[PDB]
Structure formats: C-alpha cells, structure tokens
Amino acid sequence: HWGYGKHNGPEHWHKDFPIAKGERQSPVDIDTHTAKYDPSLKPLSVSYDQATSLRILNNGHSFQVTFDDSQDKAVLKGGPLDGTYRLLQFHFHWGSLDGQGSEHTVDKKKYAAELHLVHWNTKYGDVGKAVQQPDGLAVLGIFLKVGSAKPGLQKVVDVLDSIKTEGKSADFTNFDPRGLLPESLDYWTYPGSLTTPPLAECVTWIVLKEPISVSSEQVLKFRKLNFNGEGEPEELMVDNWRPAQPLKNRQIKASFK
Numbered sequence: 001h002w003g004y005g006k007h008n009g010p011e012h013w014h015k016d017f018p019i020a021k022g023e024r025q026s027p028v029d030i031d032t033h034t035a036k037y038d039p040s041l042k043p044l045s046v047s048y049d050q051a052t053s054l055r056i057l058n059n060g061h062s063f064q065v066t067f068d069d070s071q072d073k074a075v076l077k078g079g080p081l082d083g084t085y086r087l088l089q090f091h092f093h094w095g096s097l098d099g100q101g102s103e104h105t106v107d108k109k110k111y112a113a114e115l116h117l118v119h120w121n122t123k124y125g126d127v128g129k130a131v132q133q134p135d136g137l138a139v140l141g142i143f144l145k146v147g148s149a150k151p152g153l154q155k156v157v158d159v160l161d162s163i164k165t166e167g168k169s170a171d172f173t174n175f176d177p178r179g180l181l182p183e184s185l186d187y188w189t190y191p192g193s194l195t196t197p198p199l200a201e202c203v204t205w206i207v208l209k210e211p212i213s214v215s216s217e218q219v220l221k222f223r224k225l226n227f228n229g230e231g232e233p234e235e236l237m238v239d240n241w242r243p244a245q246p247l248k249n250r251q252i253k254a255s256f257k
C-alpha cells in the first residue's frame with residue numbers, strides 16, 4: 001500500500017510501520033560543521049571486482065539491480081564496520097526536478113538523486129535475519145548532481161524503457177557497480193534505518209562526500225519510469241525520496257578533515 005504520494009507517502013508510513021517515529025530513523029541532514037572528524041575510522045574497503053549482477057527490476061518504488069549474495073563476491077569492509085557485508089542490490093531515489101531527489105541532505109542541500117548500494121552482514125547469514133539486527137546492514141549512499149554523463153550508468157539508463165511499470169524485470173548480467181563510484185571514498189557515517197518500509201533500524205549508513213555527475217538525459221530517463229503497473233493510470237516515478245528525519249541522540253562522524 002505505501003508509496004510517496006499525498007495519501008500513502010512518508011507522513012502516513014507510521015500507521016503501518018510505527019518505527020517510523022523511532023530513535024534512529026534515516027535519512028538525516030548532515031550538518032558538516034557538527035560532524036566530527038574521527039581519526040579512528042578506517043578507509044572504506046569496496047571490493048566489487050567479482051560482482052555478479054543478476055536482474056534489473058521496477059518494484060513500483062524504485063528500480064533495483066540485484067546481485068548474487070551467496071558468496072563473498074562484492075563486499076564492503078573497513079570504514080566504520082566490523083566484519084564483512086555482501087552487496088545485494090542497488091537502487092536510486094530521485095526528484096521531479098534537479099533541486100530535489102536525495103534522501104540525505106548536506107547542510108540542507110538536496111541533490112538531484114541518491115544511489116544506495118545495500119549490503120548485509122555475513123554474520124547473520126541472510127538479509128532477512130540481518131534486518132532484525134542493529135548492525136545487520138551497511139548502505140553506501142552516493143549523491144548525484146547533474147552535469148557530465150556518468151559512463152558507468154549508461155548501461156542502466158538504456159534498459160529502463162523495458163521496465164517502465166511496476167512488476168517488470170529484465171536480465172542484467174555483467175554490470176560492474178565500480179562504474180557508479182566517485183573518485184574519493186571520504187565519508188560520513190551514522191547509525192540509522194532503512195528509508196522505506198519496513199523502516200527497520202538495522203543500518204550503518206556510509207554516505208560519500210563526493211557526488212557523482214550524471215547527465216540531464218540520464219536523469220530524465222529515471223523520470224520516465226512509472227510507479228503504476230501496466231494498465232493502471234500513469235503516474236511518473238518521481239520524488240521517491242523520504243525527507244530528513246530527526247537526528248535525536250546520534251553522532252555523525254567524518255572520515256576526513
């Protein structure tokens with residue numbers, strides 16, 4: 001039932017998912033002057049060389065590229081994390097215009113979109129078990145701004161016409177998620193939640209400081225997706241972002257000075 005519109009959007013979610021009003025909800029505004037540089041934080045280890053992408057899917061809330069997570073093929077380690085986290089999927093949040101779309105904000109700045117690479121902690125064995133744990137997931141968040149094209153995104157863009165509506169999927173093998181990363185792995189980190197239902201408070205967020213640039217043609221193709229299923233009234237898939245939630249008793253740490 002949930003979505004992003006007036007009658008089923010973020011302000012309604014708490015009725016079915018009461019943790020929406022919890023103590024560690026995401027996203028948040030990252031106040032750059034308040035975030036503390038932590039010299040104990042390690043460099044992030046992103047090991048995606050052996051990634052095996054499987055499918056691309058329109059689930060009526062975003063589109064996702066799914067990966068084989070049955071072995072340590074594409075893993076996140078280091079940074080704020082203990083142990084090893086396997087990549088399961090990535091997806092995006094974006095706006096109707098370039099001045100909104102991101103979930104996290106930086107000194108109240110909204111980016112045009114935000115990429116989430118979702119990983120789960122191998123010590124819990126599968127993602128369904130991991131979402132029940134406070135250290136179950138690690139989501140790597142990357143901002144998108146509009147400028148030059150991102151070559152590593154083009155393969156994704158070019159298949160979106162095949163998954164226009166909710167419930168459509170396609171084969172999406174041999175996609176290298178390394179092509180979606182910025183140069184720097186400088187990051188902010190804090191304890192939070194999923195930003196969609198079920199809003200589980202299971203995520204260590206790692207938000208990269210450096211945005212990637214994508215072209216206007218690339219983001220325009222995101223905005224041609226539909227929230228609806230085929231045969232239902234057409235509703236453009238845009239503004240699929242949750243606003244910033246209260247920071248409450250949390251510290252955002254920076255890996256960089």
Ligand SMILES: [N]S(=O)(=O)[C][C][C][C+]123[B@]45[B@@]67[B@@]89[C@@]1%10B81%11B698B746B814B562B%10%1143
Nearest residue numbers: 089116118127131139193194195196
């Ligand atoms: N914006 S966000 O918090 O990254 C949405 C994650 C929803 C998910 B919940 B169920 B499916 C999709 B997979 B699996 B857990 B794992 B987690 B990922």
Ligand SMILES: [Zn+2]
Nearest residue numbers: 091093116195
């Ligand atoms: Zn997300």
